[PDB]
Design a protein around this ligand. Structure first.
Ligand SMILES: O=P(O)(O)OCCNS(=O)(=O)c1ccc(OC(F)(F)F)cc1
Ligand SMILES: O=P(O)(O)OCCNS(=O)(=O)c1ccc(OC(F)(F)F)cc1
Ligand SMILES: C=C(/N=C/c1c(COP(=O)(O)O)cnc(C)c1O)C(=O)O
Ligand SMILES: C=C(/N=C/c1c(COP(=O)(O)O)cnc(C)c1O)C(=O)O
Ligand SMILES: [Cl-]
Ligand SMILES: [Cl-]
Ligand SMILES: [Cl-]
Ligand SMILES: [Cl-]
Ligand SMILES: [Cl-]
Ligand SMILES: [Cl-]
Ligand SMILES: [Cl-]
Ligand SMILES: [Cl-]
Ligand SMILES: [Cl-]
Ligand SMILES: [Cl-]
Ligand SMILES: [Cs+]
Ligand SMILES: [Cs+]
Ligand SMILES: [Cs+]
Ligand SMILES: [Cs+]
Ligand SMILES: [Cs+]
Lengths: 394, 267, 394, 267
C-alpha cells in the first residue's frame, strides 16, 4: 500500500525488486511529511532563492523571431546555479535524504548536469556522493566530469551496454538495491518507480509557476503554448504542471529524433515506442518485438534514454499534451541560432525545444502566437562536442 | 505447481533439503546449455531455476549479467528458450522447473498468453524479479489460472504484513532472500533468517528456498539446519560456465563435481 | 577639455595619442547624455534584469566559517548570464556603442570572461565583435575561446610580449587608434584613459547597491568589510562604490601575489609598484628602475596585468580602501575549499578574494565580523587548468 | 629649438622641403645604429627623429615594434641612448635632433630632469607620443625651460581649437599626421591635408612635417607640393635595417640609396 497514487492512468507503478519496496515507502512518507512541514518548506525556499538564484529570468527573444508573428520567451533555467534546472529538485531531494538520516547519495547522470547538481548539493549539505555515468557520456560531456570531481564526488564510468544514460540508470538502481539503508538514490528525472515521478514534478513545479506569473506581468495573458524537451520528463513536467488546468495553454514536449525516427536511432518512445515495464515503471519503451529493451540514441546525452516518465505518457494518452520530435541536425541549427543571434549558449537538450519552437514560427510565420521555451540548461558542457562537429563541417 | 509439492514431500520423507541450481537458458549456446542442464540434473539437482535472457536484468550482478550477454551473443530469444524448455521437459518428466523472468518479457505479448505458454511447455513456477507483491495481482492471477506457481520473495527486511501476503499468495516455494543487493557469489548473507523461516511456517507458506550468495556446501547445510527447505545457487554455477568456455568437456566435469557436493550438503 | 573630472587625485588622465582624443570625448559625451536619458536607463535595466538575470543572489556560507565568529556572504556574480560580473558593464557600453552609431566592437580579454560578455552582447545587439586575447590565455582559458567563437566573434591570438592580458590590451588600443570611426573599444576594466574608469564603475555599481540592500535585509546592518579581487579594478569598484561614503565599511582589494611578491612574478602594482604612465593612464605600474613596463604574472589570467585602475590607487592613497595580495597557492586552496564545502566552483580570480576572507577568519577566529566576498565569476573556464595542476600534485 | 629655425630658413632660401628619417636608437646594436645614423646624414637627411626603445610603444605598428625589440635584445637602455646622442651631436653640430618618447620614460625619474638631460646632450625637440595636448602642460613647460622644442601632433581629425593650441604651444616643427592608425609603411594616407597646412600657417604654427605611411619619393614630393615644410619616414627606413641584418654592408648601401632618393624628392 502507498500514501499516494503511484499511477497516471495505466502508466507508472513500482516495478522494483521486493527488497527496495521499504526504501520507496520510506521516501514517499518522508515526502508527504516534508510537504506539510513549514520548516522544510522554508529551508527549501531559502536554498532555491539565496543559493540557486531563483526566480530565474524570462527573456524575450529580440532577433530570432523577426519578420514573424511569433513572440518567443525563454525561461532561463540555464542561469540557475549549476547551469540547469536539475538543481531545483536535487536541493529538495537532498533535504529529504537528510530528513531520512541518509549519509550518502547515488545518482545517475547522462548530460552530467544532474551529476553536477547532485555533487554540489552533497558538498553543501554534507552527503557523500557517487555518480554513475556512461563512458560515452564521460567523453562527450567531459566538462561536467571535471566539475563533479572538483566538488569531491566519485564519478563511476559505466562501460556496459550502450555506455550512456540507460546503462548508468541500471547501475545506480543495482547499487541502491544493496545500499539503501545508508544511501539515498537521487534519481534525476520524472521517471522510475513511484514516488519519484511525483516528487520530481513537485520539486520542479516552480518553473511553470514563475513562468505563469512572468508572462502575466509582461503580456497580461497566458502563453499559447509552453515547449520543453523530454528525456525522462523533469524539466517539461516542471514547466507544464501549473498550466495543466489552464486548458487554453498548449503543452508541447519534444523527444530526440536522433539520426531520424526512420533510422531507429532516436530516443522518442512516447510517440514511436510501445508500453512496457523497465526501470521501475510501466511506460512507453523503445523495445524489440519480443520485449527486449532497446538502446536509444541522441546527439544530446541528456535525452539519450529509451523510455519516458509516466505522467507524460498519461498526458499524451488523454490528449492534454502533444509530443513531437527534433533530429540532431535540427537541434544543432537551433543551438547555433541562439548563440549567434541571442548571445545565449544553450544545452543541446534545450536546443531540441528551441528547434521545435522555431519550426512552429517558420512553418506559419503569420500565425500570432505567444510561446515559451524552457531553456533547461546552458551549453558549456557541449561546446567541445559541438565545435568538433561544426569544424568537421564548416 | 504440483511437481514442487511432490518434490518437497519426497524430500521430507528423506529428511533432505533441496538443492536448486540456476543457469541462464542458452548460455553459452543452445546445445551446450541443454547439456549443462542435463549434467545439473544427473549430478543431483532437485529442481531447476532457469533464466530467460533479458536486455536489462536489474536484480543481477556481473556474473549473471555476463551469462545473459553470452546467450544474446548466441542469438538466443525467448521463443528459443520455450523450445528448449519443451526439450528439457520431454527428457525429465518430474523435475520442477521454475523460470526467472523480468516483467517486460511476461507483459510483452500479454500476461495471460505468457503463462499459457508456460503451461503448454510444462513449466511449474515463474518468479518475476522486478514485480513486488504490491504489483503482483495480474501476474499471480494468470499464473494460478494456468497451474503455474507464482514465486514470491521474502526479503530480510520483511514485516509481518509481507510475510502474511507471501504466505497466502505464493505457491510452489517461497524465495527467502539471503541479503540485500543483487545476485553474486562474492557477497555472502550476514543476518540469520531463522525468525522469518519460522513465521512463514506458522502462516503455512510454500516451503522456503534460500537464495543469493550461496556458493559453498557449508551454506547449503546451514540453510537446511536453519529450517529452510533448501537453497538456490546461481552465480557459483555460472562462474563454472564462464571459466571453462574453451573446454565444454571440463566445464561439465566441474559442474558435476560442484552440484554433487552442493546436493550432498543438503542431505 | 572634458565634461567630467578625468583624475582621482593624481591618478588617471587621458594619456593616449592625440588621434584618439575625439573618440574619448565622444564616448564621454555619449555617457553623460545616456546617464540623463530615461529611455537608455530603462533599456539598460531591462537587459540587466530579463536578459542577464539581476539581481544576483547573496549566499551565506554554511560550512567554511564553522567554528569561527566570521559570517561570510558571497555576492553571486558567478550566476549572471555569461558567468561573470563582466556582463553588467558590457550591456551598458554596447548600448553606448549603438548610441554613437558604431557597428563594430574591439575588446581585450584575459580570462576570456570579458571576451564572452562582449561577444554575447554583440550577438544580441547587432555588433561585429573582434577580441584580442594573449596566446597563453587562449590555452589556459580555452573554454571561453570556444564560447566566443560559437557566438560568432572573431578571436585574435596575441603572441607578442608576455602573450597575456597586457599584450591583448596593447593590440586592442593599437587597432582602435586606426578604426575608431566605425569601432567602439569596449574596455573590460575600470582602467585605461578617461572616461573608462568612470563609465565602468557607474555600469558596475549595482553590485554594491544590491549587496547593501541584501545585507540590510538579512542582517539589519552594514557589513564590516567587502572584499574583491583587483585586476584592472572593475568588480571591486562595482562592489565598493555604494559603500565609499559608509566610513564604517572596510573596502579590501586583493591583488595577485603570483609565485610570491618577493619573486617579482606577481600582478600587485598598487602595493609593490610605482606610479607611471601606460595604457592611457597615470597609475601604479610594475616597471623597471629606468621606466620600462614589466610583465606581470598570475595563475589567474584575469588578474595577470602590471597596472591597476586609478580610482583604486586614489582610494588607497587616502586610506579609504586597503589592498593586500594572495598567492597562486592561496588562491588554489580557496578554490578547492569552495568547490568541496559550498558546492560552488569559483573563477580563480574570485578565489583570490575568497582566500583573503578565509585568512581574515582563520587568523582571528574569535573576532566577530560580517564579511562579503564579491564572487566575481564561475570557474568553468578554469577547471581543466586547475585539474591539471592538482593532478600533478594529488 | 633654434637648430630647426636655422634649418627651415636655409631650406626656404633653397626652395626645398626637409627629409627627416626615423630610426630606433640602438637598433640593431649600438655600433651599427651609430653607423646607420651617420649614413642617413651623409645621404642627405635634413634632421633626425630618434626613438628611445620602450617596452610598449602603442603608436607603433609591427615594423617599429620589431626595431624596439631588436634594440632590447642588444641590451639598449635610455642611459645608453643618451651616450649615443652625445656621440651623434659631437660629430654633427648643426643637424636638428628630435626624440620620439613615450610618456613613462620622460616621467620616470622626473619630467624636469628628463628635459635637462636632453639639453645637456644637445637634443633639439621631444615628441611624446602618448601625451595629447590636453595632458601636455608639465611636458611643454619643462621642454621650453630647457630650450627643447615640444612637438605637437596635428591629426587629420583636428578641429579649430586644436589647430590654435598646437600653433601656440608648439616649437621646432608641427607634426602633421597623414592618417589615423599606427606607424607603418604598408598603410598610406588617404585624405588631402591642404586645409590643415593652410590653417597652421595662418596661426603661425611651427613649420609642418608630414608623417606616417611615407615610404616613397613621390609622397615626399606630394607633401611639399601640398605646402608642408617636409616629411618624415620611419617604417620604410627600418624595413631596410630589418631586411639586411645579416649584411651590415648592404644595409648601409640600401639606406644611402633610399635616403638620397627621398631627399631628392624634397628639392
Ligand atoms: O547465487 P546467486 O547470488 O547468483 O543468486 C541466484 C539467483 N538466481 S535466481 O533465479 O534464484 C533469482 C531470484 C530472484 C532474483 O531477484 C529478485 F529477488 F529480485 F527477485 C534474481 C535471481
Ligand atoms: O613612416 P612611419 O609610418 O613608420 O611613421 C614614422 C613615425 N616615427 S615618428 O618618430 O615620426 C613618430 C611620431 C609620432 C608617433 O605617434 C603619435 F603620433 F601618436 F605621436 C609615433 C612615431
Ligand atoms: C540526463 C541528464 N540531463 C538531462 C537534461 C534534460 C532532459 O531531462 P528531463 O527530461 O528530466 O528534463 C534537459 N535539459 C538538460 C540541461 C538536461 O541536462 C543528466 O544531466 O543526467
Ligand atoms: C581580464 C578579464 N577578467 C578579469 C576578471 C576579474 C578581474 O578584473 P576586474 O578587476 O576588472 O574585475 C575578476 N573576476 C573575473 C571573473 C574576471 O574574469 C577578462 O575576462 O578579460
Ligand atoms: Cl507544499
Ligand atoms: Cl571521491
Ligand atoms: Cl496566484
Ligand atoms: Cl558466441
Ligand atoms: Cl501457500
Ligand atoms: Cl543615472
Ligand atoms: Cl568571425
Ligand atoms: Cl535607499
Ligand atoms: Cl642581438
Ligand atoms: Cl609657434
Ligand atoms: Cs535572480
Ligand atoms: Cs516577432
Ligand atoms: Cs527519452
Ligand atoms: Cs560562523
Ligand atoms: Cs593587476
Amino acid at each position: 500500500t502507498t500514501l499516494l497514487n503511484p499511477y497516471f492512468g495505466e502508466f507508472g507503478g513500482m516495478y522494483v525488486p521486493q527488497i527496495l519496496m521499504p526504501a520507496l515507502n520510506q521516501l514517499e512518507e518522508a515526502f508527504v511529511s516534508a510537504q506539510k512541514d513549514p520548516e522544510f518548506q522554508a529551508q527549501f525556499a531559502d536554498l532555491l532563492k539565496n543559493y540557486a538564484g531563483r526566480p530565474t529570468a524570462l527573456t524575450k527573444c529580440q532577433n530570432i523571431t523577426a519578420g514573424t508573428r511569433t513572440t518567443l520567451y525563454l525561461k532561463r533555467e540555464d542561469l540557475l546555479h549549476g547551469g540547469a534546472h536539475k538543481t531545483n529538485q536535487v536541493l529538495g531531494q537532498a533535504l529529504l535524504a537528510k530528513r531520512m538520516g541518509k549519509s550518502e547519495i547515488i545518482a545517475e547522470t547522462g548530460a552530467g548536469a544532474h551529476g553536477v547538481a547532485s555533487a554540489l548539493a552533497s558538498a553543501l549539505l554534507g552527503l557523500k556522493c557517487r555518480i554513475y555515468m556512461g563512458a560515452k557520456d564521460v567523453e562527450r560531456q567531459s566538462p561536467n566530469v571535471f566539475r563533479m570531481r572538483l566538488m569531491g564526488a566519485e564519478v563511476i564510468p559505466v562501460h556496459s551496454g550502450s555506455a550512456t544514460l540507460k546503462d548508468a540508470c541500471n547501475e545506480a538502481l543495482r547499487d541502491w538495491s544493496g545500499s539503501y539503508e545508508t544511501a539515498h538514490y537521487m534519481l534525476g528525472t520524472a521517471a522510475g518507480p513511484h514516488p519519484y515521478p511525483t516528487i520530481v514534478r513537485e520539486f520542479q513545479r516552480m518553473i511553470g509557476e514563475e513562468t505563469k506569473a512572468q508572462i502575466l506581468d509582461k503580456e497580461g495573458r497566458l502563453p499559447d503554448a509552453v515547449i520543453a524537451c523530454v528525456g525522462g520528463g523533469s524539466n517539461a513536467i516542471g514547466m507544464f504542471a501549473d498550466f495543466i488546468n489552464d486548458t487554453s495553454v498548449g503543452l508541447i514536449g519534444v523527444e530526440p529524433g536522433g539520426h531520424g525516427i526512420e533510422t531507429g536511432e532516436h530516443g522518442a518512445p512516447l510517440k514511436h515506442g510501445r508500453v512496457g515495464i523497465y526501470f521501475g515503471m510501466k511506460a512507453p519503451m523503445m523495445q524489440t518485438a519480443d520485449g527486449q529493451i532497446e538502446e536509444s540514441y541522441s546527439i544530446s546525452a541528456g535525452l539519450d534514454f529509451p523510455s519516458v516518465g509516466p505522467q507524460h505518457a498519461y498526458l499524451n494518452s488523454i490528449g492534454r499534451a502533444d509530443y513531437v520530435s527534433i533530429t540532431d541536425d535540427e537541434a544543432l541549427e537551433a543551438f547555433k541560432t541562439l548563440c549567434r543571434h541571442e548571445g545565449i549558449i544553450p544545452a543541446l537538450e534545450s536546443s531540441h525545444a528551441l528547434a521545435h519552437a522555431l519550426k512552429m514560427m517558420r512553418e506559419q510565420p503569420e500565425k500570432e502566437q505567444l510561446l515559451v521555451v524552457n531553456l533547461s540548461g546552458r551549453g558549456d558542457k557541449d561546446i567541445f562536442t559541438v565545435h568538433d562537429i561544426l569544424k568537421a563541417r564548416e | 505447481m504440483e511437481r514442487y509439492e511432490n518434490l518437497f514431500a519426497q524430500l521430507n520423507d528423506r529428511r533432505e533439503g533441496a538443492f536448486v541450481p540456476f543457469v541462464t537458458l542458452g548460455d553459452p549456446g543452445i546445445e551446450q546449455s541443454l547439456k549443462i542442464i542435463d549434467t545439473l540434473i544427473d549430478a543431483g539437482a532437485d529442481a531447476l531455476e532457469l533464466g530467460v535472457p533479458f536486455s536489462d536484468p536489474l536484480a543481477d550482478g556481473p556474473t549473471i549479467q555476463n551469462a545473459n550477454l553470452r546467450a544474446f551473443a548466441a542469438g538466443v530469444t525467448p521463443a528459443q528458450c520455450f523450445e528448449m524448455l519443451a526439450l528439457i521437459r520431454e527428457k525429465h518428466p518430474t523435475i520442477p522447473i521454475g523460470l526467472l523472468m523480468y516483467a517486460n518479457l511476461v507483459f510483452n505479448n500479454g500476461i495471460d498468453a505468457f503463462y499459457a505458454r508456460c503451461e503448454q511447455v510444462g513449466v511449474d513456477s515463474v518468479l518475476v524479479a522486478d514485480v513486488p507483491v504490491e504489483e503482483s495481482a495480474p501476474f499471480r492471477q494468470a499464473a494460478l489460472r494456468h497451474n503455474i506457481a507464482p514465486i514470491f520473495i521474502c526479503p530480510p527486511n520483511a514485516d509481518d504484513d509481507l510475510l502474511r501476503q507471501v504466505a497466502s499468495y505464493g505457491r510452489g516455494y517461497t524465495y527467502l532472500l539471503s541479503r540485500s543487493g543483487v545476485t553474486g557469489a562474492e557477497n555472502r548473507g550476514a543476518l540469520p533468517l531463522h525468525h522469518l523461516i519460522e513465521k512463514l511456517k506458522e502462516y503455512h507458506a510454500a516451503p522456503a528456498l534460500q537464495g543469493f550468495g550461496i556458493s559453498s556446501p557449508e551454506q547449503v547445510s546451514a540453510a537446511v539446519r536453519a529450517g529452510a527447505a533448501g537453497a538456490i545457487s546461481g552465480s557459483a554455477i555460472v562462474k563454472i560456465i564462464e571459466k571453462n568456455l574453451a573446454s565444454p568437456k571440463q566445464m561439465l566435469a566441474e559442474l558435476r563435481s560442484f552440484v554433487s557436493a552442493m546436493k550432498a550438503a543438503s542431505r
